[PDB]
Design an enzyme around this catalytic site. Structure first.
Site, PDB file in Angstrom:
ATOM      1  CD  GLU A 145      -3.090  -1.173   2.215  1.00 14.79           C
ATOM      2  OE1 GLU A 145      -3.053  -0.192   3.090  1.00 14.79           O
ATOM      3  OE2 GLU A 145      -3.856  -2.063   2.200  1.00 14.79           O
TER       4      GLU A 145
ATOM      5  CG  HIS B 166      -6.305   0.116   4.279  1.00 16.78           C
ATOM      6  ND1 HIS B 166      -7.472  -0.051   4.950  1.00 16.78           N
ATOM      7  CD2 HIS B 166      -5.299  -0.444   4.567  1.00 16.78           C
ATOM      8  CE1 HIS B 166      -7.206  -1.013   5.757  1.00 16.78           C
ATOM      9  NE2 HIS B 166      -5.734  -1.103   5.731  1.00 16.78           N
TER      10      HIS B 166
END
Ligand SMILES: Cn1ccc2cc(N)ccc21
Ligand SMILES: Cn1ccc2cc(N)ccc21
Lengths: 195, 195
Positions: free
Chosen positions: A166, A184
């Site tokens: 990420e 997220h």
């Protein structure tokens, strides 16, 4: 715990988004197009949702999706079938779950047993055109396998809140026309933040 | 009749899309971005949903949104309050509804009384930051007024499946960052097409 509902809501939103392609439709509309045939979708009512992981978030997903007339099945090695029965989820071994599911959602920690819970072997046992949601932890769905499944049509769409890395540095999933995504956001609500 | 669950299911999708900005978040991921602060959202649990028009589609929306813990209020000229109460919708006169709602969703026919149901007058009676959904008929929400309410912040987001002109010739609404849209997809499901 305080964020169970924020996760569960996001998950249910992703499920609705995969059924109706709302993110892709909005993008189309913003690019000045009116693409009615392209975004023919499906109804949730009468479809089967598999829920892998039947803790707090998973249960909250189940009772919300039951209100849409989805049949809710699942698997958790820890939670008794008597507890999951209490909230309308039939527990089944994994091998039984794959073939039944129109939608699959994952609500597990990232363990050795759950890394690539969805992978090439488990994608193969799914019903063709399965739709997959991961609002839990990056790496539960094997990203390579998912792309292969989207490429062939074995997987008709996926919704990812989380990635193996990420931000994801490999863009092939995020760029796929049948993939919906967020950076997220599962716990990014004003309420979860602020107790 | 056939198409009522398709419409109701889209409308609920739109509502979750508005709460977590899922289409904007996908577009941002597709633009190569990882912008988490920008897409902080809201929980649906505890919020009030106003449903205008308490027919089949309105009812079906209500019972689904009740599973998310939403308080469901609404208005319908015909349906009595004891009947709406039997599906969980507390009926109130419109004047009472506007200040109470976090979300508002329209399920009316298009009539003199419902054209611009939402207009500059009614928006200014709303709570600041109201979110609005129109999956019913273009014009129930006056589009000029909705634009002004979005430009001021009185309306925090809108979700439109329908337009006064289809495709929409005017572009300001569709192009707004807080507006999500589709090309009149409320009945566009395989199941609804097929009988
Ligand atoms: C392999 N697996 C599948 C679902 C699940 C849930 C937990 N909590 C642990 C492992 C699991
Ligand atoms: C003015 N108004 C508000 C809601 C509604 C529903 C119907 N069916 C007709 C008119 C209406």
């Amino acid at each position: 715990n305080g964020n169970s509902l924020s996760a569960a809501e996001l998950t249910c939103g992703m499920i609705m988004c995969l059924a109706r392609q709302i993110p892709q439709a909005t993008a189309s509309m913003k690019d000045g197009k009116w693409e009615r045939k392209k975004f023919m979708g499906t109804e949730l009512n009468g479809k089967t949702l598999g829920i892998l992981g039947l803790g707090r978030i998973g249960r909250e997903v189940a009772t919300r999706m039951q209100s849409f007339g989805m049949k809710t099945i699942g698997y958790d090695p820890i939670i008794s079938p008597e507890v999951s029965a209490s909230f309308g989820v039939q527990q089944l071994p994994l091998e039984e779950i794959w073939p039944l599911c129109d939608f699959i959602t994952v609500h597990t920690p990232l363990l050795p047993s759950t890394t690539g819970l969805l992978n090439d072997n488990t994608f193969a046992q799914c019903k063709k055109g399965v739709r997959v949601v991961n609002c839990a932890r990056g790496g539960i769905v094997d990203e390579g396998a998912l792309l292969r499944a989207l490429q062939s049509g074995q997987c008709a769409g996926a919704a990812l809140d989380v990635f193996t890395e990420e931000p994801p540095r490999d863009r092939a999933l995020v760029d796929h026309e049948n993939v919906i995504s967020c950076p997220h956001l599962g716990a990014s609500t004003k309420e979860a933040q602020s107790r």
